[PDB]
Design a protein around this ligand. Structure first.
Ligand SMILES: NC[C@@H]1O[C@H](O[C@H]2[C@@H](O)[C@H](O[C@@H]3[C@@H](O)[C@H](N)C[C@H](N)[C@H]3O[C@H]3O[C@H](CO)[C@@H](O)[C@H](O)[C@H]3N)O[C@@H]2CO)[C@H](N)[C@@H](O)[C@@H]1O
Ligand SMILES: NC[C@@H]1O[C@H](O[C@H]2[C@@H](O)[C@H](O[C@@H]3[C@@H](O)[C@H](N)C[C@H](N)[C@H]3O[C@H]3O[C@H](CO)[C@@H](O)[C@H](O)[C@H]3N)O[C@@H]2CO)[C@H](N)[C@@H](O)[C@@H]1O
Ligand SMILES: [K+]
Ligand SMILES: [K+]
Ligand SMILES: [K+]
Ligand SMILES: [K+]
Ligand SMILES: [K+]
Ligand SMILES: [Mg+2]
Ligand SMILES: [Mg+2]
Ligand SMILES: [Mg+2]
Ligand SMILES: [Mg+2]
Ligand SMILES: [Mg+2]
Ligand SMILES: [Mg+2]
Ligand SMILES: [Mg+2]
Ligand SMILES: [Mg+2]
Ligand SMILES: [Mg+2]
Ligand SMILES: [Mg+2]
Ligand SMILES: [Mg+2]
Ligand SMILES: [Mg+2]
Ligand SMILES: [Mg+2]
Ligand SMILES: [Mg+2]
Ligand SMILES: [Mg+2]
Ligand SMILES: [Mg+2]
Ligand SMILES: [Mg+2]
Ligand SMILES: [Mg+2]
Ligand SMILES: [Mg+2]
Ligand SMILES: [Mg+2]
Ligand SMILES: [Mg+2]
Ligand SMILES: [Mg+2]
Ligand SMILES: [Mg+2]
Ligand SMILES: [Mg+2]
Ligand SMILES: [Mg+2]
Ligand SMILES: [Mg+2]
Ligand SMILES: [Mg+2]
Ligand SMILES: [Mg+2]
Ligand SMILES: [Mg+2]
Ligand SMILES: [Mg+2]
Ligand SMILES: [Mg+2]
Ligand SMILES: [Mg+2]
Ligand SMILES: [Mg+2]
Ligand SMILES: [Mg+2]
Ligand SMILES: [Mg+2]
Ligand SMILES: [Mg+2]
Ligand SMILES: [Mg+2]
Ligand SMILES: [Mg+2]
Ligand SMILES: [Mg+2]
Ligand SMILES: [Mg+2]
Ligand SMILES: [Mg+2]
Ligand SMILES: [Mg+2]
Ligand SMILES: [Mg+2]
Ligand SMILES: [Mg+2]
Ligand SMILES: [Mg+2]
Ligand SMILES: [Mg+2]
Ligand SMILES: [Mg+2]
Ligand SMILES: [Mg+2]
Ligand SMILES: [Mg+2]
Ligand SMILES: [Mg+2]
Ligand SMILES: [Mg+2]
Lengths: 155, 73, 117
RNA sequence: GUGGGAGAGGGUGGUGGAAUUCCCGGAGUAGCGGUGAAAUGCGCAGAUACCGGGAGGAACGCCGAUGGCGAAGGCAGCCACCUGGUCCACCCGUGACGCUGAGGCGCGAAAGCGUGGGGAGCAAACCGGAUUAGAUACCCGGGUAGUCCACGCCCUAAACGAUGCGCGCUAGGUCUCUGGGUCUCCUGGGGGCCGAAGCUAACGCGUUAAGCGCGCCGCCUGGGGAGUACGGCCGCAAGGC
């Protein structure tokens, strides 16, 4: 996007909870344009959230999302002939995209046998502050602020 | 552009060649010890030329300083 | 163990490093810090963050002497000058004055080739 | 001639403050320095930063400028003495005493040479550290000559307005420096910009001529060979003409 600002797409509401965040997660689950497979996965996982946790699966979902969102990240920059790891803030939408993407990328690294189980277990784990996703956020916020010396290269 | 004030019109009758008159030459030095330019002093070529030498004359005597420290920065 | 409680905080900034020297009112130093006192080794010492850490470590060293009020004196143009200022400005120490005493000659010596023209 | 003006014009003596370095004392601790990043280097025999004292060499911040002075080179803290050039008013005096100028003579940035001093900072050479494919460099740490002083040499330059000197004639507008005056303005000297006529191959110049004229000097005659060779004069030599 060199000319315009590249406005964002508005997503259709969740067909079950009526929440755009849910539908965004389904789309990050989707693979080869299989919408039904991604939503089947996700909902079969919402049933796994219950009878393990007595809470509404929506709460666990958005809570884990909140625990994965990073506040800082490190972006490179070409300066003085070398390249520097420069921290700066994470725009809100980017915290969204990175938290959701990380959630999926973590769930598919898990050892559970079928998908929705991995998704449920990662959603729960990240909701209570553990699991591979939150380790991604902690690794990134470790990267940033470890380079605090370059905080003036913000741009 | 020094639209705050000019030092000459901030002053009445005075002798440019008085090296010993401090409480007026004081008015021509900056917050540091430096000699103000014609932007601030509002002097003319000849006037600033002579006032310069009488200020230097005063500096040797220990009446005006050569340099000062900057406050509040 | 002097119990000074009031003194002068010198700041020596340069494009290579920033170094803080904290003194009694007469000017004799009590403690000090810099970019190298903290773990910074290479060019990082000339950082405004390195300066911030140096001034904070200086202020914390001086708290152990129970110092409260300081007068700050900056010398040298260089990164981290104003950041060391702002580090001390709320470091716990009260800054009573800031003064820029950067030494300038009256055309005294010939600079290096690096600084000529 | 008289009476006033302006100026880093020159020489000599004296002298003031800032900074660097070094030495001394005090306080204080693990580094400082430096770079694109580094390293060499410096620091536990206590450095860097910080206060007090002291020594010495060099250079004069602001003022300061599109400013001034000078024939050119060039000239900048301040005080005094010696000394050059110039400008204005007054119409006083001399009565064409003028202009230019081969040769001559004097001057002549830097670098360089001799003797003797001095030597803080900077720094050819050189010694290291880096970089690079190499790096006899650019960058970093050191450092000798030198840079400074007296005296004597050398005599070159993008020594430049790349524009010899003098005098007369040819629209103006504007900025500035320094005089004079009936001080809105008039008038003289100097420094800038734009432009009449005009000139120029063009660029541009244009009352500060590169315009229109006169006087005298210096100089050019296609590029390389070559500022070389030879001769001569000069020089301690480098080398110059
Ligand atoms: N020349 C040194 C300087 O003289 C300045 O003052 C100088 C000028 O202001 C002053 O001008 C004088 C004066 O009598 C009047 N205005 C006219 C007179 N023709 C000038 O004298 C002039 O001509 C004579 C030879 O005839 C020269 O010796 C002298 O140097 C020159 N100034 O003469 C002084 C000496 O030249 C300042 N004192 C200072 O800048 C510095 O010391
Ligand atoms: N000293 C003032 C000036 O000295 C000039 O020459 C003087 C100086 O060049 C020379 O050296 C002097 C001397 O006191 C002694 N040998 C050492 C002293 N440090 C020097 O004095 C000067 O030296 C330089 C300039 O050379 C200046 O930068 C510095 O301020 C001053 N210390 O001594 C000369 C006098 O004896 C001229 N006479 C003239 O410009 C003026 O009077
Ligand atoms: K040394
Ligand atoms: K100079
Ligand atoms: K000029
Ligand atoms: K007048
Ligand atoms: K032109
Ligand atoms: Mg991952
Ligand atoms: Mg450094
Ligand atoms: Mg003079
Ligand atoms: Mg000592
Ligand atoms: Mg060692
Ligand atoms: Mg020991
Ligand atoms: Mg040793
Ligand atoms: Mg030192
Ligand atoms: Mg001292
Ligand atoms: Mg010595
Ligand atoms: Mg200037
Ligand atoms: Mg002239
Ligand atoms: Mg001239
Ligand atoms: Mg010149
Ligand atoms: Mg007559
Ligand atoms: Mg007659
Ligand atoms: Mg002649
Ligand atoms: Mg001749
Ligand atoms: Mg010469
Ligand atoms: Mg010389
Ligand atoms: Mg010599
Ligand atoms: Mg010698
Ligand atoms: Mg010697
Ligand atoms: Mg020596
Ligand atoms: Mg050196
Ligand atoms: Mg060197
Ligand atoms: Mg080498
Ligand atoms: Mg190469
Ligand atoms: Mg020798
Ligand atoms: Mg010249
Ligand atoms: Mg020129
Ligand atoms: Mg001209
Ligand atoms: Mg000229
Ligand atoms: Mg001419
Ligand atoms: Mg000529
Ligand atoms: Mg003549
Ligand atoms: Mg004129
Ligand atoms: Mg001129
Ligand atoms: Mg023109
Ligand atoms: Mg025409
Ligand atoms: Mg034209
Ligand atoms: Mg003419
Ligand atoms: Mg010839
Ligand atoms: Mg010729
Ligand atoms: Mg031929
Ligand atoms: Mg030739
Ligand atoms: Mg030759
Ligand atoms: Mg011969
Ligand atoms: Mg001979
Ligand atoms: Mg040779
Ligand atoms: Mg020969």
């Amino acid at each position: 996007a060199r000319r315009r600002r590249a406005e964002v797409r508005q997503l259709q509401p969740d067909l079950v909870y009526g929440d755009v965040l849910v539908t965004a997660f389904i789309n990050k689950i989707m693979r080869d344009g299989k919408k039904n497979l991604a939503a089947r996965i996700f909902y079969d996982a919402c049933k796994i959230i219950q009878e393990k946790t007595g809470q509404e699966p929506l709460k666990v979902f958005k809570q884990a999302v909140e625990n994965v969102k990073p506040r800082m990240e490190v972006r490179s920059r070409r300066v003085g002939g070398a390249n520097y790891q420069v921290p700066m803030e994470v725009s809100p939408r980017r915290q969204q995209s990175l938290a959701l993407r990380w959630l999926v990328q973590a769930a598919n690294q898990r050892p559970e046998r079928r998908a929705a189980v991995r998704i449920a277990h990662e959603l729960m784990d990240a909701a209570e502050g553990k699991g591979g996703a939150v380790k991604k956020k902690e690794d990134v916020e470790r990267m940033a602020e470890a380079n605090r010396a370059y905080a003036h290269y913000r741009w | 552009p020094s639209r705050k004030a000019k030092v000459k019109a901030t002053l009445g009758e005075f002798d440019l060649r008085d090296y010993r008159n401090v409480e007026v030459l004081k008015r021509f030095l900056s917050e540091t010890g430096k000699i103000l330019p014609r932007r601030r002093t509002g002097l003319s070529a000849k006037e600033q030329r002579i006032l310069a030498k009488t200020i230097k004359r005063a500096r040797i005597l220990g009446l005006l300083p050569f340099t000062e420290k900057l406050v509040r920065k | 163990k002097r119990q000074v409680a009031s003194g002068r905080a010198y700041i020596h900034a340069s494009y290579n490093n920033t170094i803080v020297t904290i003194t009694d009112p007469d000017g004799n130093p009590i403690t000090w810090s810099s970019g190298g006192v903290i773990g910074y080794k290479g060019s990082r010492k000339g950082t405004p963050y390195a300066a911030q850490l140096a001034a904070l470590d200086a202020a914390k060293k001086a708290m152990a002497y129970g110092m409260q009020s300081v007068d700050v004196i900056v010398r040298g143009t260089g990164a981290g000058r104003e950041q060391a200022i702002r580090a001390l400005q709320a470091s716990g120490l009260q800054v009573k004055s800031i003064v820029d005493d950067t030494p300038v000659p009256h055309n005294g010596c010939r600079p290096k080739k690096k600084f000529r023209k």
